Write an enzyme that holds these catalytic residues in place. Structure first.
Site, PDB file in Angstrom:
ATOM      1  N   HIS A  55      34.977  61.768  40.378  1.00  0.00           N
ATOM      2  CA  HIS A  55      36.341  61.188  40.094  1.00  0.00           C
ATOM      3  C   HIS A  55      36.469  60.118  38.955  1.00  0.00           C
ATOM      4  O   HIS A  55      37.167  60.118  38.048  1.00  0.00           O
ATOM      5  CB  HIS A  55      36.481  60.045  41.296  1.00  0.00           C
ATOM      6  N   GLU A  56      35.268  59.462  38.840  1.00  0.00           N
ATOM      7  CA  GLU A  56      35.362  58.438  37.465  1.00  0.00           C
ATOM      8  C   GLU A  56      34.910  59.105  36.403  1.00  0.00           C
ATOM      9  O   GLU A  56      35.585  58.713  35.446  1.00  0.00           O
ATOM     10  CB  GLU A  56      33.926  57.369  37.797  1.00  0.00           C
ATOM     11  N   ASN A  68      22.844  77.655  38.797  1.00  0.00           N
ATOM     12  CA  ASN A  68      23.457  76.470  38.338  1.00  0.00           C
ATOM     13  C   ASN A  68      24.384  76.620  37.240  1.00  0.00           C
ATOM     14  O   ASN A  68      25.119  75.576  36.695  1.00  0.00           O
ATOM     15  CB  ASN A  68      22.943  74.978  38.604  1.00  0.00           C
ATOM     16  N   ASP A 124      26.335  62.088  26.309  1.00  0.00           N
ATOM     17  CA  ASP A 124      27.681  61.888  26.157  1.00  0.00           C
ATOM     18  C   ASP A 124      28.641  61.234  27.057  1.00  0.00           C
ATOM     19  O   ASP A 124      29.701  60.383  26.705  1.00  0.00           O
ATOM     20  CB  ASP A 124      28.394  63.299  26.350  1.00  0.00           C
ATOM     21  N   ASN A 176      28.380  70.787  22.335  1.00  0.00           N
ATOM     22  CA  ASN A 176      27.085  71.588  22.491  1.00  0.00           C
ATOM     23  C   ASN A 176      26.546  71.813  23.872  1.00  0.00           C
ATOM     24  O   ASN A 176      27.043  71.355  24.923  1.00  0.00           O
ATOM     25  CB  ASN A 176      26.000  70.627  21.786  1.00  0.00           C
ATOM     26  N   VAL A 210      17.342  74.982  38.593  1.00  0.00           N
ATOM     27  CA  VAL A 210      18.136  75.679  39.542  1.00  0.00           C
ATOM     28  C   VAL A 210      18.444  76.918  38.850  1.00  0.00           C
ATOM     29  O   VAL A 210      19.528  76.849  38.151  1.00  0.00           O
ATOM     30  CB  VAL A 210      19.286  74.560  40.065  1.00  0.00           C
ATOM     31  N   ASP A 254      20.881  71.874  14.100  1.00  0.00           N
ATOM     32  CA  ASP A 254      22.066  71.626  13.154  1.00  0.00           C
ATOM     33  C   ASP A 254      21.170  70.846  11.950  1.00  0.00           C
ATOM     34  O   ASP A 254      20.827  69.797  12.328  1.00  0.00           O
ATOM     35  CB  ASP A 254      23.025  71.006  13.558  1.00  0.00           C
ATOM     36  N   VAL A 255      21.026  71.502  10.807  1.00  0.00           N
ATOM     37  CA  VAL A 255      20.236  70.505   9.727  1.00  0.00           C
ATOM     38  C   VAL A 255      21.549  70.217   8.638  1.00  0.00           C
ATOM     39  O   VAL A 255      22.412  70.707   8.503  1.00  0.00           O
ATOM     40  CB  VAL A 255      19.332  71.524   8.700  1.00  0.00           C
ATOM     41  N   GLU A 278      17.757  76.537  32.124  1.00  0.00           N
ATOM     42  CA  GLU A 278      16.767  75.786  32.145  1.00  0.00           C
ATOM     43  C   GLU A 278      15.221  76.231  31.949  1.00  0.00           C
ATOM     44  O   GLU A 278      14.932  77.292  32.041  1.00  0.00           O
ATOM     45  CB  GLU A 278      17.008  74.977  33.533  1.00  0.00           C
TER      46      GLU A 278
HETATM   47  C1  LIG Z   1      37.457  52.643  49.922  1.00  0.00           C
HETATM   48  N1  LIG Z   1      38.153  52.269  48.759  1.00  0.00           N
HETATM   49  C2  LIG Z   1      39.071  52.981  48.244  1.00  0.00           C
HETATM   50  O1  LIG Z   1      39.057  54.113  48.494  1.00  0.00           O
HETATM   51  C3  LIG Z   1      39.916  52.621  47.347  1.00  0.00           C
HETATM   52  C4  LIG Z   1      41.641  52.551  47.821  1.00  0.00           C
HETATM   53  C5  LIG Z   1      42.659  52.340  46.893  1.00  0.00           C
HETATM   54  C6  LIG Z   1      43.817  52.812  46.749  1.00  0.00           C
HETATM   55  N2  LIG Z   1      44.603  52.034  45.822  1.00  0.00           N
HETATM   56  C7  LIG Z   1      44.036  51.300  45.389  1.00  0.00           C
HETATM   57  C8  LIG Z   1      44.307  50.156  44.135  1.00  0.00           C
HETATM   58  C9  LIG Z   1      43.369  49.336  43.814  1.00  0.00           C
HETATM   59  C10 LIG Z   1      42.026  49.399  44.580  1.00  0.00           C
HETATM   60  C11 LIG Z   1      41.927  50.278  45.379  1.00  0.00           C
HETATM   61  C12 LIG Z   1      42.746  51.169  45.910  1.00  0.00           C
HETATM   62  N3  LIG Z   1      39.868  53.098  46.048  1.00  0.00           N
HETATM   63  C13 LIG Z   1      38.860  53.138  45.114  1.00  0.00           C
HETATM   64  O2  LIG Z   1      37.793  52.528  45.130  1.00  0.00           O
HETATM   65  C14 LIG Z   1      38.970  54.281  43.924  1.00  0.00           C
HETATM   66  C15 LIG Z   1      39.360  53.260  42.658  1.00  0.00           C
HETATM   67  C16 LIG Z   1      39.596  54.266  41.418  1.00  0.00           C
HETATM   68  O3  LIG Z   1      40.649  54.963  41.205  1.00  0.00           O
HETATM   69  N4  LIG Z   1      38.671  54.106  40.458  1.00  0.00           N
HETATM   70  O4  LIG Z   1      38.742  55.085  39.246  1.00  0.00           O
HETATM   71  C17 LIG Z   1      37.894  55.226  43.519  1.00  0.00           C
HETATM   72  C18 LIG Z   1      37.622  56.099  44.890  1.00  0.00           C
HETATM   73  C19 LIG Z   1      39.027  56.944  45.298  1.00  0.00           C
HETATM   74  C20 LIG Z   1      36.648  57.129  44.562  1.00  0.00           C
HETATM   75 CA   LIG Z   2      19.628  76.952  35.842  1.00  0.00          CA
HETATM   76 CA   LIG Z   3      26.689  66.541  24.128  1.00  0.00          CA
HETATM   77 CA   LIG Z   4      23.925  72.536   9.351  1.00  0.00          CA
HETATM   78 ZN   LIG Z   5      40.352  56.186  40.087  1.00  0.00          ZN
END
Ligand SMILES: CNC(=O)[C@H](Cc1c[nH]c2ccccc12)NC(=O)[C@@H](CC(=O)NO)CC(C)C
Ligand SMILES: [Ca+2]
Ligand SMILES: [Ca+2]
Ligand SMILES: [Ca+2]
Ligand SMILES: [Zn+2]
Ligand SMILES: *[C@@H]1O[C@H](CO)[C@@H](O[C@@H]2O[C@H](CO)[C@@H](O[C@@H]3O[C@H](CO)[C@@H](O[C@@H]4O[C@H](CO)[C@@H](O)[C@H](O)[C@H]4NC(C)=O)[C@H](O[C@H]4O[C@H](CO)[C@@H](O)[C@H](O)[C@@H]4O)[C@@H]3O)[C@H](O)[C@H]2NC(C)=O)[C@H](O)[C@H]1NC(C)=O
Length: 414
Positions: A138-139, A211, A90, A196, A208, A287-288, A215
């Site tokens: 975060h990402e 968690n 995914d 799923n 684990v 799923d078929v 598994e």
């Molecule tokens: C050490 N570097 C940091 O903490 C900078 C700080 C930052 C604040 N405002 C900005 C605007 C543009 C570029 C960087 C910054 N932030 C990041 O790398 C974050 C970028 C982000 O939002 N990715 O989705 C991801 C992090 C929070 C995990």
């Molecule tokens: Ca488990």
């Molecule tokens: Ca999936």
């Molecule tokens: Ca089916």
């Molecule tokens: Zn971000």
């Protein structure tokens, strides 16, 4: 109740060299970081499980550059055209030892399940696993439609995951704003791929017990003894207890096998047979779908991945009532090769339909809804140019279907 993200992680060459080629070491970090990400998301009613790991120990498959935008776009393209075609999953995140310009991570927003955009890149910013886990959470959060916190957004007296900068003392908490924006996204866009539940054999990290992911070697898993609400399971041991034939699965009701014949996965259409419980197993069979190309809807279509796509229904879904397939003449516009009239794209270019393929490009409908008279109505939006295009597998003539922008004989299409 819970959504599941089947994650694949990719580790670049720079990180392999940074850990001096020790793949076991790299693998262990990945298992550790994902385990923490799964814990972080419990509060969000989402589980994260590592189902694949690719380590570029020889050469990177894309050019990993400090310009994060270039790298994320290249990684997304690679995932779409390569990885995803040979590995079901995914979402995919690339970990890199390169110091990305201005950021330590980057990801598309509200893109979970998208073939190219259900991706993000993460800089191996610290040797501390909790720290990289926060970056990863975060990402992925962005992918789940979450934007940066601000204003009254709060996650208590801690530094929230979605703050725009990472905290030197990062917590594992999401703000309340993150929680609502994430579910708003799921409910309004319903990313189907995270519905799923991955099979234990699909998960590659070491098992684990506790968690909340079932598994290999476990009869059940309902989290810690504290959290466990599964009366069918002994949390501490992941073993069944009391009068339990089972403690998991769509074919497990009140800890017992659902009786044979009980439907467990409803039919999407005549092209999708429903699956039923055996009466002796706790899981619903895989799923078929009936073979693609099989005649459906009283010969107005041919089966395609469990559905029966026909132009009438596509016109309806796009424009509502009183709208039907347009006259053949309307489809000739697909030979223009202009912004809306084409059959497919090559290296980003829009390719006009050859005359025999006109029925497989942009769809044209005859609009006879109240107060309307448009014989060749079509749908075009630059938000997603593919919306409005004839669906793959759609019957384009007697004995023919669309496949890659081409109207071909159905007998040899599949
Ligand atoms: C050490 N570097 C940091 O903490 C900078 C700080 C930052 C604040 N405002 C900005 C605007 C543009 C570029 C960087 C910054 N932030 C990041 O790398 C974050 C970028 C982000 O939002 N990715 O989705 C991801 C992090 C929070 C995990
Ligand atoms: Ca488990
Ligand atoms: Ca999936
Ligand atoms: Ca089916
Ligand atoms: Zn971000
Ligand atoms: C996440 O969880 C957190 C809990 O930690 C939630 O935080 C709360 O958010 C509320 C807004 O969603 C805040 O309410 C606002 O508080 C301010 C400050 O008290 C109010 O402004 C003052 O209002 C009084 C009268 O009501 C006036 O006499 C003052 O002059 C105002 N002060 C100033 C300088 O403006 C806000 O009221 C104003 O705005 C509303 C419109 O929203 C309007 O109807 C009012 O007439 C008034 O103009 C408003 O009540 C809470 O203060 C805040 N709690 C904490 C602990 O900070 C957060 O909402 C949650 N978010 C999510 C996504 O769930």
């Amino acid at each position: 109740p819970f959504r599941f993200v089947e994650l694949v992680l990719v580790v670049d060459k720079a990180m392999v060299t940074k850990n001096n080629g020790d793949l076991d070491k790299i693998k262990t970090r990945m298992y550790e970081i994902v385990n923490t990400v799964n814990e972080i998301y419990r509060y969000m009613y989402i589980h994260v499980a590592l189902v694949g790991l690719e380590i570029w120990s020889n050469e990177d498959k894309i050019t990993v550059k400090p310009e994060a935008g270039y790298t994320l776009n290249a990684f997304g393209e690679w995932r779409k055209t390569d990885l995803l075609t040979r590995k079901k999953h995914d979402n995919a995140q690339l970990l890199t030892a390169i110091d990305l310009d201005r950021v330590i991570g980057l990801a598309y927003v509200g893109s979970m399940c998208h073939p190219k955009r259900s991706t993000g890149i993460i800089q191996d910013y610290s040797e501390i696993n909790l720290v990289v886990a926060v970056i990863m959470a975060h990402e992925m959060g962005h992918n789940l439609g979450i934007n940066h916190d601000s204003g009254y957004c709060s996650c208590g007296d801690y530094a929230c995951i979605m703050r725009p900068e990472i905290s030197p003392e990062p917590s594992t908490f999401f703000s309340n704003c993150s929680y609502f924006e994430c579910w708003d996204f799921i409910m309004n866009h319903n990313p189907e791929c995270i519905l799923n539940e991955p099979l234990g054999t699909d998960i590659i990290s070491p098992p684990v017990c506790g968690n909340e992911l079932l598994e290999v070697g476990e009869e059940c898993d309902c989290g810690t003894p504290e959290n466990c609400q599964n009366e069918c399971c002994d949390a501490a041991t992941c073993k069944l207890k009391s009068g339990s034939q089972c403690g998991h699965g769509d074919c497990c009701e009140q800890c017992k096998f659902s009786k044979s014949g009980t439907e467990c996965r409803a039919s999407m259409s005549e092209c999708d047979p429903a699956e039923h419980c055996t009466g002796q197993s706790s899981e619903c069979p895989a799923d078929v779908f009936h073979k693609n190309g099989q005649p459906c809807l009283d010969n107005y279509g041919y089966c395609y991945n469990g559905n029966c796509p026909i132009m009438y229904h596509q016109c309806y879904d796009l424009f509502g009532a009183d709208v039907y397939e347009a006259e053949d003449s309307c489809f000739e516009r697909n030979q223009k090769g202009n912004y809306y009239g084409y059959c497919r794209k090559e290296n980003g270019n829009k390719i006009p339909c050859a005359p025999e393929d006109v029925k497989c490009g942009r769809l044209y409908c005859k609009d006879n809804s109240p107060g309307q008279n448009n014989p060749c109505k079509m749908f075009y939006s630059n938000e997603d140019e593919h919306k409005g295009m004839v669906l793959p597998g759609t019957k384009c003539a007697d004995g023919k279907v669309c496949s890659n922008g081409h109207c071909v004989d159905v007998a040899t299409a599949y």
